[PDB]
Write a protein that binds this ligand. Sequence first.
Ligand SMILES: *C(=N)[C@H](C[C@@H]1CCNC1=O)NC(=O)[C@@H]1C[C@@H](C(F)(F)F)CN1C(=O)[C@@H](NC(=O)OC)C(C)(C)C
Ligand SMILES: *C(=N)[C@H](C[C@@H]1CCNC1=O)NC(=O)[C@@H]1C[C@@H](C(F)(F)F)CN1C(=O)[C@@H](NC(=O)OC)C(C)(C)C
Lengths: 305, 305
Amino acid sequence: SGFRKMAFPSGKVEGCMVQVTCGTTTLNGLWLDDVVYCPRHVICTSEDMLNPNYEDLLIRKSNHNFLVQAGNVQLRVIGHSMQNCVLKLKVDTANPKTPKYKFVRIQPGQTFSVLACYNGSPSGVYQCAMRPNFTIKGSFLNGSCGSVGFNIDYDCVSFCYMHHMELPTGVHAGTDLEGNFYGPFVDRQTAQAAGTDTTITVNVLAWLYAAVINGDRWFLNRFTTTLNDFNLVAMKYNYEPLTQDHVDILGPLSAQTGIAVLDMCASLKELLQNGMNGRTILGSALLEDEFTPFDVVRQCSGVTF
Amino acid sequence: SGFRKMAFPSGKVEGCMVQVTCGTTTLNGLWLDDVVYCPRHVICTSEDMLNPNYEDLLIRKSNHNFLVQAGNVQLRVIGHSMQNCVLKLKVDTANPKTPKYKFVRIQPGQTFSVLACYNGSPSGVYQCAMRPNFTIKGSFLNGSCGSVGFNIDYDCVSFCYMHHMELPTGVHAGTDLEGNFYGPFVDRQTAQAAGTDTTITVNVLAWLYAAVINGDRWFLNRFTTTLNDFNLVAMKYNYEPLTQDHVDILGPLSAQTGIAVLDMCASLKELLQNGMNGRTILGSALLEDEFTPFDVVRQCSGVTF
Ligand SMILES: *C(=N)[C@H](C[C@@H]1CCNC1=O)NC(=O)[C@@H]1C[C@@H](C(F)(F)F)CN1C(=O)[C@@H](NC(=O)OC)C(C)(C)C
Ligand SMILES: *C(=N)[C@H](C[C@@H]1CCNC1=O)NC(=O)[C@@H]1C[C@@H](C(F)(F)F)CN1C(=O)[C@@H](NC(=O)OC)C(C)(C)C
């Protein structure tokens, strides 16, 4: 037992990271089959990022202006194109280490592993969540752009995120692998507001189930609540409304613990209204919302890949 | 920027996890060169574990009583021996995926990545600390024994932990890869006490430096303290004494931020005596002690592997 923020094993993805240089800038790209993907701002000088015309900037570039390195293997660029905010570089070699893979656009509240990368070499792996305002709380320095986020199901890597920018908040923003930003963001160095964020209620409930499974029981009370009355308190404390869809997704956890979902909501209610009183739940003094119901089941049942 | 519990990329170690079966029990083994390392309690039945004579039990076992699967292919066991609490199974095939590697017995307070596996297949990766009472707060289910903990040093994998048991606390105990338990623990299913834990002071200070580096400067105070004077309040709150050696280890962080180590202690002192008053530091409402000085610099300067 025990409960940790656990990332997927990163070996499948490590074999796809390459270094993409154009001009002076170097960042990471994703090498799948004979295509390398990376953020289009690799083609910008520091002055362009204030107000970049990416189409005009790309036209000044040809295949040989792109240096792609996979370790020391120097890939030859034989084609380049823009898809939204990603550059696709056609290379003469298919990646032999290519995993079975999908490109997925994930939904707010879902989680994914990030393989943080510099100069085409992996540095570390950690778990993130897509916040409701389509940002992530990552750990990214200069040179990390092009690092990817992913999930794994048995053998198939689902790529969902590529890193592009850090906001003024210290939060992070990026695209899916078709190059469409999550959220309202553009790849321009001008002030950009992230919306108001809120707490992912179905994830907090799933983490309370994990707590109960592991013996942390003190917050279970003798009360209950309705969906509409719980939602009244959730709006008051900036929580997503709970829907019957969320209730259904919590079925597996509800069934394994014999605690009804609305019983667990009444515990959350009392935690929100009365705080934690200095006690902890699974070692945290705050309510955790970075664990989906699938994350809890995978860790409490032992699913492998 | 940002600050996350970041694990090492696990690719080099995934290619080393095999499945080891003896009789009815199956757990994980580490396959390096022509040797498979796994916990010796694989040779036990559920009744032997109450009071096992391991030398006597190993004598009932033959090479062909052990069966090692690496993914789908079988390895031929041609030799078996007991080194303390690990079994070394000589196989006929050197692991083609063996990384450059060392075996290391780490010190309390140090951290490592854990690759959690079941049936020889990786499930997830997370960061852990060797607590001062030589346990770790992990996440391990049935079948997880033989999962390893490790650090990476560019190309070299330093193996430091093999998982063995769960203690009454829900905490975890294990050995180094020469089979010597960390702590006073033995591999027998009887009541075993972990000693009283304490909070790793030099790690808490390293995490305050990470907070300052990332913009949380509220805890910075307009007081200071002395080594001895700090140790009086640290002992009162079950913190390790701060030694000059630890002061020297925090040099790099001290130099980059321009805050002397003894200044940071006086902020920590006032956090301990006065709590956090409902504020957070790097998104936590508790004092974090699972980041070494080296983990902070790795994450706040971008070291790759
Ligand atoms: C990628 N290598 C960096 C990663 C960034 C640096 C510090 N922490 C990070 O995550 N990405 C950038 O620098 C982008 C590229 C430019 C642009 F997005 F194309 F405009 C500028 N970038 C930014 O992240 C800026 N943020 C911003 O403009 O928010 C609106 C900052 C961080 C100011 C350079
Ligand atoms: C290995 N696959 C398991 C992992 C264990 C199961 C539940 N959570 C875990 O981490 N290892 C064991 O079950 C060991 C093997 C036996 C022995 F250590 F060799 F004696 C018993 N094990 C335990 O972990 C027991 N703990 C214990 O006796 O500590 C005093 C329990 C968890 C009671 C089976």
